[PDB]
Amino acid sequence: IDTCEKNSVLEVIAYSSSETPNRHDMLLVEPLNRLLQDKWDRFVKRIFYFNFFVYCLYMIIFTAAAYYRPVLPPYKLKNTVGDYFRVTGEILSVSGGVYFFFRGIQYFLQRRPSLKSLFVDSYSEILFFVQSLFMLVSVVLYFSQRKEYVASMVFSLAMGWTNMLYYTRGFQQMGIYAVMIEKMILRDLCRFMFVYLVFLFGFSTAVVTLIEDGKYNSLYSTCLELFKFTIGMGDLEFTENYDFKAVFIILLLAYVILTYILLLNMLIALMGETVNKIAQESKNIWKLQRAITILDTEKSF
Amino acid sequence: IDTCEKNSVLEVIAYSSSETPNRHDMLLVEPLNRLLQDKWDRFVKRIFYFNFFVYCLYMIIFTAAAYYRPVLPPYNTVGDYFRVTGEILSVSGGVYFFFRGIQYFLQRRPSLKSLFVDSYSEILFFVQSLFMLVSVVLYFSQRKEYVASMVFSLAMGWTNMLYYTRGFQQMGIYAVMIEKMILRDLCRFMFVYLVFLFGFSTAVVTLIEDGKYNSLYSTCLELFKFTIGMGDLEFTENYDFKAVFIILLLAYVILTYILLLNMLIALMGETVNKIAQESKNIWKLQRAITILDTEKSF
Amino acid sequence: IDTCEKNSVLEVIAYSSSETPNRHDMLLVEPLNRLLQDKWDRFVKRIFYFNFFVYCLYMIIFTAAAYYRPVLPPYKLKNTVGDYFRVTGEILSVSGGVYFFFRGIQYFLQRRPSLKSLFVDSYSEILFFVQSLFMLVSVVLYFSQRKEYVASMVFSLAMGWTNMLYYTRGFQQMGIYAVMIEKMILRDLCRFMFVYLVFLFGFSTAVVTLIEDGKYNSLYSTCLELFKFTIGMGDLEFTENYDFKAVFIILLLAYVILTYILLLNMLIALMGETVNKIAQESKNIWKLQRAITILDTEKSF
Amino acid sequence: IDTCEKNSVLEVIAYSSSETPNRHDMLLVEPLNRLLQDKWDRFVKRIFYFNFFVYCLYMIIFTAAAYYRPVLPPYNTVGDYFRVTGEILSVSGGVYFFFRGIQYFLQRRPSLKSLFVDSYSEILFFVQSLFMLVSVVLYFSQRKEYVASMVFSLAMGWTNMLYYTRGFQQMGIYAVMIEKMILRDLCRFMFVYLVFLFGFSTAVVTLIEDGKYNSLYSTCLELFKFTIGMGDLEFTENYDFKAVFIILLLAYVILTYILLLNMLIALMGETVNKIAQESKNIWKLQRAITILDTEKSF
Numbered sequence A, C: 001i002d003t004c005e006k007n008s009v010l011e012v013i014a015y016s017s018s019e020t021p022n023r024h025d026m027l028l029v030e031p032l033n034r035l036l037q038d039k040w041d042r043f044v045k046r047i048f049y050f051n052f053f054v055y056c057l058y059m060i061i062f063t064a065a066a067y068y069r070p071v072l073p074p075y076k077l078k079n080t081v082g083d084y085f086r087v088t089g090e091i092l093s094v095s096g097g098v099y100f101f102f103r104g105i106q107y108f109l110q111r112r113p114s115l116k117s118l119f120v121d122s123y124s125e126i127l128f129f130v131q132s133l134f135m136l137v138s139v140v141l142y143f144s145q146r147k148e149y150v151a152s153m154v155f156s157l158a159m160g161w162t163n164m165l166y167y168t169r170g171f172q173q174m175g176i177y178a179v180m181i182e183k184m185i186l187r188d189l190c191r192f193m194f195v196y197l198v199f200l201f202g203f204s205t206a207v208v209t210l211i212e213d214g215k216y217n218s219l220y221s222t223c224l225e226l227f228k229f230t231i232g233m234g235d236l237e238f239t240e241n242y243d244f245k246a247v248f249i250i251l252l253l254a255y256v257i258l259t260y261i262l263l264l265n266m267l268i269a270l271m272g273e274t275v276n277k278i279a280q281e282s283k284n285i286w287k288l289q290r291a292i293t294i295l296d297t298e299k300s301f
Numbered sequence B, D: 001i002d003t004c005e006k007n008s009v010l011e012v013i014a015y016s017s018s019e020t021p022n023r024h025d026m027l028l029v030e031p032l033n034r035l036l037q038d039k040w041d042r043f044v045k046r047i048f049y050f051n052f053f054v055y056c057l058y059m060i061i062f063t064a065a066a067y068y069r070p071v072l073p074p075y076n077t078v079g080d081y082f083r084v085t086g087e088i089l090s091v092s093g094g095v096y097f098f099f100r101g102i103q104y105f106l107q108r109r110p111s112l113k114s115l116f117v118d119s120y121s122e123i124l125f126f127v128q129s130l131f132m133l134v135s136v137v138l139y140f141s142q143r144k145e146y147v148a149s150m151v152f153s154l155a156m157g158w159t160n161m162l163y164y165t166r167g168f169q170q171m172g173i174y175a176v177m178i179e180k181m182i183l184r185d186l187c188r189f190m191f192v193y194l195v196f197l198f199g200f201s202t203a204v205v206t207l208i209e210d211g212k213y214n215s216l217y218s219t220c221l222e223l224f225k226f227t228i229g230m231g232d233l234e235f236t237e238n239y240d241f242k243a244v245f246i247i248l249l250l251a252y253v254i255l256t257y258i259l260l261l262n263m264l265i266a267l268m269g270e271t272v273n274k275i276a277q278e279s280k281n282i283w284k285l286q287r288a289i290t291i292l293d294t295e296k297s298f
C-alpha cells in the first residue's frame, strides 16, 4: 500500500489520471487517510513548509532584482554594493528559473501525460513551467541586445507572484479556497468570458462603425471605452463625432443593460449556486492535492 | 414515429404551440431523448458545425465591409473591390435570411400569438434582416440613415450568434438561462427601476431653475449614471435649497443603487437555484427542434 | 363573508389587526380565497384598472413642472393657451391632493386605527397621506409669498411618484415582487442603514478631526467625500491639507475595508438568503393585500 | 445554580474557555434560558440601557472637544472653557476604561491564548484606551503625533458602539454575524487578494521606467483603486510595450474585480445560509454573560 518498489495503492490512486471515475472517493478509505494524514504531519509538511520558505525567499530576491533594473543590454557592473546585490539577485533568480524549467521537463518525461487536456489537469506544474519559460526567454533576449527582455521579466514577475498560491495547500480552509477559485475560473469565468467577449466585441464593432472620426475611431479605442463600463467607469459621453445621438445613446444603453445589469449579476448568482453545490467535491479534490503532495515529497526524499 | 410521412410524434411534440402543458418534459422518455441525441450524433451536429462556420465567416465579412464605409450615397483599386464585394455578400446574406424568415412564417403559419412567445431567434433574425434591407433601400435612396440601420443590424447580428451556442450542453444551458433571466427578472427590475428613475428625474428637473440639465433628457441621463458607479452627486449648483437637492439625490441612490440594484442579484440567485431542470429540458427541446429542422431541410 | 354582513368573514379577516397570530393564512382559506377571486374579476378588478388609469393621468397632469414652473408667488396669467393649461393643471393637482388628504383623514376616523403598527403594516396609506400633506403645505407656501413651495411640491411629486408602486399591485408577479421590496426595505435596509451610519459617521468624524484646514474642514464635506465611496466614486486623495499622510491613508483604507468590501456584500448575502426563505409568505401577504384592496372597492362600489 | 461563591453552573458556562466542545448550546436548555431572560427583564436590561446612554454621551463629549481642537502643544471664553472641560472628561473616560481593562485582565487571569481568541470586545476597548493615554502623553510631551493618536482613538470609539448592540435580538445577531464574517471570509479574501495585488503592482512598477508612478506606494494605490470601481487603465504612458502594460492591467482586473469579489460574495452567502443557529447561540451567550457580569458588578 505505501512502499512496494513496483507499485503501491497510494501511488496508483494519487497519480491516477482523471479518467478514473471515483479518483476523489478512492482516498477517504480509513487506512489511506490515516496513513496520508500521518505522512502529512510526519515529513511531507516539514519538506512542504521549508520549501515554501525557500520559494518565498526566491520570489523576494527575484522582485528585488527586477525592481532595481538599471535604465540596449547587456550592461556593465558599476562599483557599488547595490550593483553587486542586484547582479547576484538576478543571477540567483535566473538560476531558480532554470531549475524550475528542468523540474518541469523531468515531470513531462517521467509522468508522460497522454496529450489529453493536460492544461486543466495538473495545471499547477504547467503554470510553473510557463514561469520558468518566461524567465529563460527573458535571459536569451537580454543577451540578444533587445528590450523585450523587460516585457518578459514583468510577465515572469507577474506569473511567480500569482502562482505563489500553490503553497496554500497544507492548510485546510486556505486549500479549499484555492481549489474552489481554480474550478470557478475553469467553469463560471470561462463561460461568462466567452459570452461577454461576443457582446462587448459586437456592440463595440457597431459603435466604431457608427462613429465618424476622432481619437475613438479605432476599434481598439472603442472596445476600451465599452470595457470601461464593466469596472464602474462607463462614461456615456466619451465621443460626439457622430451624426446621430439617438443611435449612439440607444446602442450604449442596450450594451449597458445587456452586459453590466444582466451578465455580471447573473454571474454572481451562478457563482453562489456553484459555491452552494460543491463543499464535499472541493474537500475531496483538496484531499487529492495534499495526498499527491505527501507522495511527491516521499519520492523527493 | 420519425419517418411516417403522415404525422410524426417527434414533430407533434416539437412543433406543438406553448399551449401543450408538457412539450418540454415529455421528450425525456427513453425513446424520444435517445432518438434525438442520436439524430444529433448522426446528421445534425456536423450539419450545425458547418452552418455556424458559414454564419461566422459571413459576420466577419459584414464587419470588415461596414468598418471601412467611405464618408449622400450611393458611393478603381483592390481595396474598393474587396469592400464592394463584401457589401454585396452582406446584402446577399441579409436577403437570404429575409426569405428564410418569410418561409418559416408561411410554413409554420403561426397563430398570430406564438410569434411573440415562441422562437425568439426567428423573430430576432427577421428583424436583423429587415434592418439590413432598410439600410439597403435608404442607401440607394440618397440618405445618411443607411449607416444608422446598418450599425443597428450589425449590433443585432453580432448578438444573434448566441443562437448557435445550442449544440453545446453547457453553453446552450447558459443561453437558455440568459433568455429566462431577461424574460422575468430583468423585465420586473426595468419596470420598477424606470418608474423610480422617471419620478426622481422629474423631481430634480423641477427643483432646478436655469442650468445645463434643465432638459429632462440630460437630468435623466445624470440620474441613470448613478447605476453604473459613475454618479456625480454635485453635477449642478445653479439652484436654491441645497438641502432639498441633496436629500432628493440621497433618497434616489438608496431606493435604487442601494436597494433595487442589489434586489436584482438576490432574485437572480433564487431563480437560478430553481430553474436548472427546466433550463436543461428547454435546451433539449431547442436541440430536438434543430434536429427536426435539419431533417426537413433535406 | 360565509353568510354574514355586520362582521362578514372576508371583511374581518382582511381588516384584521397586527396582533392576530396567523392572519396570513386566513384569506388563503380555499372558500375565502375564492370570495376575493370570483369577486376580484367580478367588478373590483374593473374598478381597480380604471382607478389606476385615473391616478396615472392625475400624476402626469402634475409631473410636467418643467413646463409649468415660472421663474415671489403668487404669479400672473399670461393670457395664452400654455398658461391656461398650466393653471388648469395646477388647480387639478391641488384639488386631487385635497381629495387624497380628505380620503386619508376619512380612513383615520372610520378605522380609528392603532396608528402604531400603521407605519409597518398598511404603511401605503401613510405615504399617500404624506404626499397629500406636502401638497397642502405647498399650496399655503405658494399663497404665503415664500419660495419653499418649490421644495415642498418637488418632494410631493417624488413622494407620489414612489407611491405609483402601490397601484403596481393587482398582478401576481409584480405585486409579490413589490412585496419583497416592501419587506426588504423594512428589515435588511434598516439594519444595514443603522450599522453603516454609525461606521460612516465615526470615520468622517476621525477624518475631519485629522484634517487641519481646507474646503473639506467642514464635517458635512468630509462626510460626503467618505460617502462617495459607497457609490463607486471614492477618491482616496480628496483632501491635501490634513495631518501627516501616515494617518489619513490608513484610516481611509480601514473605512473602505469595513464598509465597502464588507457591509454591502453582507447586505447582498442577507437579502439573498432572505429571498430564499420568503416565497409562500410573500404570496400569502400579496393575497391578503388584494383581498383588502378589492374589499375597499366593494365598500366604495 | 446561581452562586455558591466557589463554583456555579451559570459562571461555569459563562467563564469556561472556548476549548469546551459545545459552550454555545448549553444555555439552550429550559432552566438556564428562562432564568437568564427573567434576570435580564428584571434589572440587567434597565442597567444595560443606562450604561449605553452614558457611553453615547461620553463619546459625543470627547468627539466635540477633538473636532474643535486649536491648530507646539500644549496650549477666558465660554467655548475654550467648554473645550478644556470636554477634554478633561474625555481623558477621565479613557482612564476609566484603562482601569476596567486592567481589572478584567487581572481577574480573568487569561492563559495568553484565549486573550487574543475571545473577549475581542474587551481587547478593542483597551486598545482605544491605550491610544488615548499615549495621546495624552504626546500632548504633554510637546509633539504633534497626539492628533494622530486622538483621531485613531476617536475612530475606534465610534466603531465600538457595536458592543452595546447586544441586548437587542436583531442588532445582536447582525453584530455577531459581522464578527464571524470578518474572522473568516474577509481575512482569507484579504490574504489572497493582497498576494495578487503585490504581484501585479511589482510587475507594473517594474514595467515603468520613470515618473511619479515609479514608486511602489503610488502604483500600488493605483492598482488598489480598481477594486472600488474607480480604475483608470490609462494612469501612465511613460514606458514602452503598451501591449505589455494593457495585458498586465487586463489580467489583474479579470483576476480580482470579476472573479475574487464575486467569489467573496458567494462564500459570504454560503456562510450566512449556514450560520443562523450558531449566530443566535453566540448572541445568547453574549447576553447571558452580560446578565452574569451585571450580577457580579453589584
Ligand SMILES: CCCCCCCCCCCCCC(=O)OC[C@@H](O)COP(=O)(O)O
Pocket: A123, A124, A125, A127, A154, A155, A158, A159, A162, A163, A164, A165, A166, A167, A178, A182, D247, D248, D251, D252
Ligand atoms: C501569461 C499570463 C499573463 C502574464 C502577466 C500577468 C500575470 C497573470 C498570472 C496568471 C496566472 C495566475 C492565475 C493562476 O492560475 O494561479 C494559480 C495559483 O492559484 C497557484 O495555485 P495552484 O498550485 O495551481 O493550485
Ligand SMILES: CCCCCCCCCCCCCC(=O)OC[C@@H](O)COP(=O)(O)O
Pocket: B247, B248, B251, B252, B255, C123, C124, C125, C127, C154, C155, C156, C158, C159, C162, C163, C164, C165, C166, C167, C178, C182
Ligand atoms: C421627505 C424625504 C424626501 C421626499 C422625496 C420623496 C421620494 C423619496 C422616497 C420616498 C419614500 C420611498 C419609499 C416609497 O415611497 O415606496 C412606497 C411604495 O412601496 C408604494 O408601494 P406600497 O403601497 O407600499 O405597496
Ligand code: NA
Pocket: A231, A232, A233, B228, B229, B230, C231, C232, C233, D228, D229, D230
Ligand atoms: Na465606479
Ligand code: NA
Pocket: A231, A232, B228, B229, C231, C232, D228, D229, D230
Ligand atoms: Na462600481
